[PDB]
Amino acid sequence: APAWTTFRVGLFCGIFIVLNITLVLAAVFKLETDRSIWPLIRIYRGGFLLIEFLFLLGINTYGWRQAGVNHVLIFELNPRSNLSHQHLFEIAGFLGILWCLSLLACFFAPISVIPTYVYPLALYGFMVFFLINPTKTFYYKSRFWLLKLLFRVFTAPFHKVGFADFWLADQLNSLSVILMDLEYMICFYSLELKWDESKGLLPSGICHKYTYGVRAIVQCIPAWLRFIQCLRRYRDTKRAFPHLVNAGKYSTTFFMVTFAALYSTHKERGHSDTMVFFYLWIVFYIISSCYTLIWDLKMDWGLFDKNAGENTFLREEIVYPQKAYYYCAIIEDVILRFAWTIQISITSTTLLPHSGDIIATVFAPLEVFRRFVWNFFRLENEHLNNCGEFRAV
Amino acid sequence: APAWTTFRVGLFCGIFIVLNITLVLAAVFKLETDRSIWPLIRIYRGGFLLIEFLFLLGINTYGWRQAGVNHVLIFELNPRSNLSHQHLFEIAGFLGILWCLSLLACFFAPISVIPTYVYPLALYGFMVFFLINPTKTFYYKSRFWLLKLLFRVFTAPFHKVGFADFWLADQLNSLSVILMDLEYMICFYSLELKWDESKGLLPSGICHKYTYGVRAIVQCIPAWLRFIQCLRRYRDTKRAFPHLVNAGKYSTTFFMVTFAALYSTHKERGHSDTMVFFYLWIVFYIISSCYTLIWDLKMDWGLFDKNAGENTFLREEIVYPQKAYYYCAIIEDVILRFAWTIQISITSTTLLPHSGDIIATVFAPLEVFRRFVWNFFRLENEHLNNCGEFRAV
Ligand SMILES: CCCCCCCC/C=C/CCCCCCCC(=O)O[C@@H](COC(=O)CCCCCCCCCCCCCCC)COP(=O)([O-])OCC[N+](C)(C)C
Ligand SMILES: CCCCCCCC/C=C/CCCCCCCC(=O)O[C@@H](COC(=O)CCCCCCCCCCCCCCC)COP(=O)([O-])OCC[N+](C)(C)C
Ligand SMILES: CC(C)CCC[C@@H](C)[C@H]1CC[C@H]2[C@@H]3CC=C4C[C@@H](O)CC[C@]4(C)[C@H]3CC[C@]12C
Ligand SMILES: CC(C)CCC[C@@H](C)[C@H]1CC[C@H]2[C@@H]3CC=C4C[C@@H](O)CC[C@]4(C)[C@H]3CC[C@]12C
Numbered sequence: 001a002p003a004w005t006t007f008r009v010g011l012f013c014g015i016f017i018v019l020n021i022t023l024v025l026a027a028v029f030k031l032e033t034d035r036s037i038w039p040l041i042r043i044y045r046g047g048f049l050l051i052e053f054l055f056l057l058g059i060n061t062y063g064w065r066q067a068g069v070n071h072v073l074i075f076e077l078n079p080r081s082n083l084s085h086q087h088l089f090e091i092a093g094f095l096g097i098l099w100c101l102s103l104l105a106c107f108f109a110p111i112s113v114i115p116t117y118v119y120p121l122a123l124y125g126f127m128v129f130f131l132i133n134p135t136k137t138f139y140y141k142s143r144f145w146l147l148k149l150l151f152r153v154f155t156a157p158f159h160k161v162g163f164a165d166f167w168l169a170d171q172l173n174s175l176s177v178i179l180m181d182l183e184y185m186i187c188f189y190s191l192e193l194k195w196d197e198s199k200g201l202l203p204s205g206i207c208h209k210y211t212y213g214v215r216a217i218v219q220c221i222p223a224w225l226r227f228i229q230c231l232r233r234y235r236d237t238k239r240a241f242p243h244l245v246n247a248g249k250y251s252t253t254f255f256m257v258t259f260a261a262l263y264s265t266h267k268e269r270g271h272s273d274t275m276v277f278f279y280l281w282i283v284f285y286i287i288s289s290c291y292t293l294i295w296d297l298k299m300d301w302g303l304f305d306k307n308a309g310e311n312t313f314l315r316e317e318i319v320y321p322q323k324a325y326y327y328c329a330i331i332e333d334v335i336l337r338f339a340w341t342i343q344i345s346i347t348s349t350t351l352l353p354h355s356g357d358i359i360a361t362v363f364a365p366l367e368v369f370r371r372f373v374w375n376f377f378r379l380e381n382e383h384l385n386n387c388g389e390f391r392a393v
Numbered sequence: 394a395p396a397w398t399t400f401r402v403g404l405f406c407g408i409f410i411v412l413n414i415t416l417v418l419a420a421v422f423k424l425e426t427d428r429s430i431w432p433l434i435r436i437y438r439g440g441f442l443l444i445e446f447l448f449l450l451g452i453n454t455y456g457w458r459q460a461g462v463n464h465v466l467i468f469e470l471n472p473r474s475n476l477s478h479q480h481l482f483e484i485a486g487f488l489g490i491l492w493c494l495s496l497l498a499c500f501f502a503p504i505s506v507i508p509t510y511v512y513p514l515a516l517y518g519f520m521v522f523f524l525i526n527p528t529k530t531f532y533y534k535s536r537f538w539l540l541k542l543l544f545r546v547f548t549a550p551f552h553k554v555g556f557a558d559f560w561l562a563d564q565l566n567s568l569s570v571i572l573m574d575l576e577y578m579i580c581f582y583s584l585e586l587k588w589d590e591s592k593g594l595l596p597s598g599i600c601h602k603y604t605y606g607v608r609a610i611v612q613c614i615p616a617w618l619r620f621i622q623c624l625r626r627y628r629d630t631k632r633a634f635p636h637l638v639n640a641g642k643y644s645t646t647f648f649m650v651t652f653a654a655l656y657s658t659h660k661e662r663g664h665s666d667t668m669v670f671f672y673l674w675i676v677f678y679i680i681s682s683c684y685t686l687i688w689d690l691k692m693d694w695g696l697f698d699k700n701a702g703e704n705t706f707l708r709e710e711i712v713y714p715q716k717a718y719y720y721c722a723i724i725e726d727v728i729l730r731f732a733w734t735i736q737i738s739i740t741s742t743t744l745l746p747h748s749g750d751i752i753a754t755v756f757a758p759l760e761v762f763r764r765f766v767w768n769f770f771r772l773e774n775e776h777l778n779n780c781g782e783f784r785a786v
Contacts, residue, residue: 001396003394003399006396006399006400006403007399007400007402007403008403009400009403010399010400010401010402010403010404010406010407011403011404011406011407012407013403013404013407014403014404014405014406014407014408014411015407015408015410015411017408018407018408018411018412019411022415
């Protein structure tokens, strides 16, 4: 990379660091105890998760390049022009500066005239604009490639699946919280925000409950897309394995989230059917967790193979130098696959609100971390032994 | 330069920027009107000027390298392990972060126990330690070369002059304010600071007055070193020109600063000899400015030459692309050589107390800027046509 690119990476990282420190200190001093800070947390959580995802993605690209995994051939990107990790670090740092500035302005009151609710709106409006700018400025080829890919994923039955389509839909399975925060923000300004008050951003009413049957559809949105892609892939190929077995993996989420919305609704009423539904919500919690975990370990990463030989419990060939990495990865995935399922059901109105909001906010970055670790061995098991059969050489 | 070096340059620059912005805002809000902020300004001015000097020096090194001026041969540095501009930018950024942090802590009160006067002391103590660290860490070769050079300059009659000795003594002629701030700080804590009070840094006294006669000797410390070096050069070379004419250039400062302590001293008394002294101070103020300016233009930069030809008013060969640079430089040097002499006389108490401290604080960075511009054409006129007769090829 050129020297100005590394200069810009470091510049944005340093501004981000100091902005974070002053954010924490203003939080522990300037803020006032009486008002509620939760809408404010629920609104900014999505941008935080997006920035973290881009940073971790930049570390993924560095790891793939150094270890020798040909990720340009698998994604079928152009050999000549490709983003390297420094460009991703730069985008992450810039969007992080805007996030820190908007949140800081929401804590302070730098301008009297401007109402506080404007700042959250001004941040997310800018991000959409940067992505959809018509002019050939600011990584225009990257934004255009991403936009064409996004169009194909959201219209799933109609296109032939390629590695990139399959890959982005999975990433969207772990980023579901951003969609929920967006539906929550869209709902909140429309119904529970009083526009007339000068500082109405920090005011419960009905804006954080799975009651109007919308929040369930919103977390089943990515699982539905992957289930549909698996069915289309089965149509073309005509092989029941592994396309019909994989679709079921994605269908388990429907039953589990269906039951959340059911026990919570029955409980809130004076109904005695609540116990029965509670028996079922639990059963479709262990089934889903075990099914996703076994699929991860044996089919996604390709471990526990018969001819492992020396690398015991692993596969025959390994690309990353240390076996410790693989063993820590196995244990980490095992303990975080159990954490993911609980936060999914919980979002759909289960545990009384006071204790629930701190579990989701703590466990969302850990789900992004689990996807970050999943990327390494998935791409490695693709490069070695053609696992998805997307190229079929 | 390696990528980690550029990353570090940008990191320290970004932290420095945000620290400066919060410094300004805390100055215009947190600070209190009743107490005096001048001791606090006179103490930190020296560190500010040192940081600015290092940054501008880094720009000088970039300019010399690109234009093709062999500054490694002139300074006689080792061709294998030289420093580049990025390393200077890095030192400047790091020391600037420490300066901003210490001043910020002096504005706030982050720790109750610690008295405020400790922080100025903690900053300058660290800087000395970084320079004199015995261990081979943190640019140990650079610090050792600089330390040997400094020893030779402060013991001037005893060593043979080389380009590096002559060059550092001149740089010290424009950095005289740092010495004054140091003598002022050394004096202030000892006599006018009441140790018992918790916040006595921002309390007037005898500290800034040129009376005991100490401040005049500190004013003429660098001019004396250059005058002595010129006499030594004439002893070895046996040439009355330009070593006896150049020594006089440096001797004019003695008469100039001797008529400031005198007029100021006579005025404060009920003495009628004050008028006579004032008519002499102006005469030497004007004889010094013209002498230094003519020497600069004709002997240091080598302009106004007879065989200029096409480059009119310039010399025959020019290395920097645009003539506009040379013309702006001539005008800038002409108008700043008049500014330099006023603040030298003024420091030794010529004006009233209120009308003087803002002139020195504004005109000190402009003197550092004039030396920054002087460096380009001095090194260029050395590389072209060997002017100082130091190598004598
Ligand atoms: C909260 C609301 C905010 C709205 C968003 C606002 C902020 C978001 C802003 C985003 C602007 C751009 C962000 C960085 C990505 C740019 C594209 C890119 O990097 O492609 C890289 C591919 O490299 C890879 O193959 C690995 C994948 C990299 C990222 C893939 C998508 C990541 C974003 C997923 C996010 C999903 C979001 C969906 C909804 C959550 C580089 O491609 P290329 O090498 O340049 O290709 C050129 C060669 N070619 C011409 C042949 C193609
Ligand atoms: C009260 C407030 C103040 C309190 C006091 C604070 C004090 C604390 C201050 C701490 C600051 C310490 C600064 C460290 C700088 C390292 C030195 C350096 O860079 O040498 C460079 C010289 O390279 C050149 O000659 C190129 C241009 C000239 C620079 C020479 C002097 C630069 C520093 C002038 C500074 C003037 C400052 C003087 C101050 C009196 C690099 O040398 P090299 O290329 O690595 O040579 C190696 C090859 N060799 C082995 C053959 C040699
Ligand atoms: C239980 C917890 C501690 C498990 C932690 C697992 C994490 C830390 C492990 C699992 C996979 C590991 C990564 C595997 C591959 C690479 C690529 C290599 O070129 C750099 C190290 C890097 C980036 C490893 C970093 C550490 C890593 C992310
Ligand atoms: C009256 C005022 C505005 C005069 C200003 C003069 C200043 C701005 C001029 C005079 C000498 C000039 C420098 C002369 C040489 C170089 C080296 C070249 O490779 C980069 C530009 C640079 C660094 C110039 C920057 C601008 C400069 C510093």
